[PDB]
Amino acid sequence: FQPTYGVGYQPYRVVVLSFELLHAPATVCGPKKSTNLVKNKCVNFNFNG
């Protein structure tokens, strides 16, 4: 590995992520984007499912 080598003989750091899709109890989840809370109005609420 030299810096003068062209692109293709240069080092590439590779990270491979592996998942199992919805067959066991899951421990890794994506983030939840909660909005602001509005009171005293007829709204459609979604609280923790």
Partner: protein, 48 residues
């Protein structure tokens, strides 16, 4: 799902289970997804 419910109770009875009512709060749900058919308690020795 492995549900662990637990309750801490301050008692002062010597030998047996006290007679009373105490509902166990849900403590922790565990994502284990495994078969379990047998169990064993773990104790601690005292060495001198």
């Amino acid at each position: 799902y492995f549900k662990i419910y637990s309750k801490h109770t301050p008692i002062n009875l010597v030998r047996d289970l006290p007679q009373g009512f105490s509902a166990l709060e849900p403590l922790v749900d565990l994502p284990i997804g495994i078969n379990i058919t047998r169990f064993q308690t773990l104790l601690a020795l005292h060495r001198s």
